[model samples]
Target chain A: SMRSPITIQRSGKKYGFTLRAIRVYMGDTDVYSVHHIVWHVEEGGPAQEAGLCAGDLITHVNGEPVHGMVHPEVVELILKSGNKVAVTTTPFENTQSLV
Target chain B: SPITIQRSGKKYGFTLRAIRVYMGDTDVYSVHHIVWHVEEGGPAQEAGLCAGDLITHVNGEPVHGMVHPEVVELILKSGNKVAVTTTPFENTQSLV
Candidate 1:
């Protein structure tokens, strides 16, 4: 079961976003990592204007799957994607259930 | 030179072997997992890191006297591009 997409348009100075990540172990046989949008994008930034919400778990970045990727790797992808990073996100509630 | 991190509060999954510290039979001196024993298909294995490798540096910072938790924190906070240096366990054993 996956979630909907959140498209963020990045351009100009300060795209305005920050992220955090955590590793979750599921049922001894499985382990995975997830990214959380801990900081809000600037009010007038592309992400904010586009309605990107904090506290969601970003599962994808720029069409690249990020389920097991480390936080820094994901961050590198986001920065290198330049403009138009497409992200898949699930609500915190969904994450809690999965974890 | 210091390897700067672009973001804060990030995490990565890895285990180390510690020297003299413990949490109920756990070693608290180094990574909890041996390099050679990195799980197949896991991130560590995919990255071409091998077991019996002792990671002595993270992001160009020396970790000689660092405790296990401190090393883990350094790795997690090392931003998107982390540089790690390891010495083969055999080589280390020869020196000791």
Candidate 2:
């Protein structure tokens, strides 16, 4: 099954969601790459209106794959867009959870 | 032992938790700002920070009794791109 990536678009600084990080402990229990969640999307906010939700796992920001980034690095990436941003997401599974 | 982190107005790749420990014979508790997480190559990591490291100063201001939020403000406002110091948490026992 091919998991599709969905991109959400929002303008301005009111995207209305908090970004949070999670560790991927691999045996040593992990690697340098990490994951982020689009959490707390406010009802009726731009992000929510564009199909983003609290369970969306952010895989990329502005088309650049972020498997190697920390939360703030990705944050800077989004912030770099200035006044608008494109965020790519894959539902968190349990991963089957957001827009 | 202290290590300083600088990142040019960027967010450092780490989280801090304020820890409270009772002083040996005193009735008061002390606050210790401890690092909870740090990602490789991020500002904090480049500064050699790691989970459980203690942040004892913010821009050279001793983190003596500041709450977590105050400590965070110091980092956020001091331009966060200079002079924040940390020590290995294991060594905090003797210092505290």
Candidate 3:
């Protein structure tokens, strides 16, 4: 899925969110990579307050690209950002085609 | 980091992965072939669970020949503390 970037800025609390990085393998070759926001933002949390909805794709954190980062690396970026950070995301789009 | 068994009194911080095989266009899910990924900052990682570790048993019970949903049910029924035995991915040993 292609993603467009949306910036989120939050302070005073950790952004309560989760990311899903998917991997698919064909034989020994990993051929697919995609990331998606999982579940909903915590109510009244920084993510929600910053307008980050569920299904958004995280693209960048603190001006650093995150699209190709492994799960742990992306998580580390979020953790080290402390109580304030800027995040970029792509809003979830409906991919279904009308039958 | 060395692949050590990280545990906190039976608690493991990790999530699972499974494989599906297609035999003549039919999908077959392997229940005992489950592998685990240790989440960052999760108990499994903190306790030493590493990604790509193969889960052979849960709560001292072998998982060979079990089905997908059955394994899930077992995990759900297992409360907070779970005893899981896992091996490194490189071992290339058969779970069955």
Candidate 4:
């Protein structure tokens, strides 16, 4: 079944959430990329108190990483989950040495 | 002064030959496909396209998704025009 469309804002804060885009590299291929978000809600907010720092990438929320999501559909499932929940984010770091 | 090219995080043969759209720094929205309908005068525009037009392929390959801006640079260096197709959304309401 087709789901309702979500309107993501281009810039600025919305619903305690902020939007960002990024690219990913694997081996020698620029294989995966995505546009996700980071949120600044409130002190002691579930995401904040859980060590979900302001800059952590939301790789997994409530224990769900994005590796296996079917696309377009899972986005809604996340928005509906609400707060007071622990969302996990992956800090962007690499293991490669400078050439 | 001698002209020397300065490369930041990554370098492309011609700077500005590629455009980088940074996703959220913290969280990310799942995006599988993209369709470009906006026109900016340059190679991307001179390649027989315009706003509201759909790009079905990139270098004769279906664009299932994108890697990173640096990776995209590699594709551009290979001497192929990357055609991207994305649905356009306008006049959408913001609830924040």
Instruction: Rank all candidate structures by their DockQ, best first, as comma-separated numbers.
Output: 4, 3, 1, 2
- In candidate 2, what are the lDDT values of residues B1-96, reduced to their tens digit? 456677754577777765433222223334456665677778878877766555667777888767777887777776756576665333111100
lDDT of 2 by residue, A1-99 (tens): 123445445655556777765443322222323455554577777777777766455666666666647777877787677656676665332211000
> On a 0 to 1 TM-score scale, where does candidate 1 land against the true structure?
0.41
Residue A36 of model 3, lDDT score: 28
Model 1 residue runs over 4 Å out of place are A27-34, A92-99, B1-96
Q: True contacts preserved, each candidate?
A: 0.00, 0.00, 0.00, 0.05
What lDDT score belongs to each candidate, Candidate 1 first? 0.48, 0.58, 0.50, 0.34
Candidate 3 has which clashing residue pairs, if any? B6-B47, B6-B48, B13-B43, B13-B44
Model 2: residues >4 Å from true position, as ranges? A1-11, A28-32, A92-99, B1-96
Q: Candidates sorted by TM-score, descending order?
A: 2, 1, 3, 4
Cα deviation at A81, candidate 4, in Å, is 1.0
Write down the C-alpha DockQ for each prediction: 0.02, 0.02, 0.03, 0.06
Per-residue error (Å), model 2, residue A71: 1.0
Candidate ranking under lDDT, highest first, comes to 2, 3, 1, 4
Among the numbered candidates, top DockQ falls to 4
lDDT tens digits, residues A1-99, model 1?
Answer: 244567777657445776654333332233433323333445677877766755444656665566656666777777777777777655432111000
* Per-residue lDDT over A1-99 for candidate 3, one digit per residue giving the tens place of the 0 to 100 score: 223334445564456665555332332233534332333477786677767765454566776765446777777787787767666555343321100
Each model's TM-score, in the order given? 0.41, 0.42, 0.40, 0.32
Q: Count clashes in each candidate, considering only residues at least 3 apart in sequence or on different chains.
A: 17, 5, 4, 17
CAPRI quality level assigned to candidate 3 from its DockQ score: incorrect
Best by TM-score: 2
At residue B46, what lDDT does model 4 achieve?
A: 46
Candidate with the larger DockQ of 1 and 4 = 4
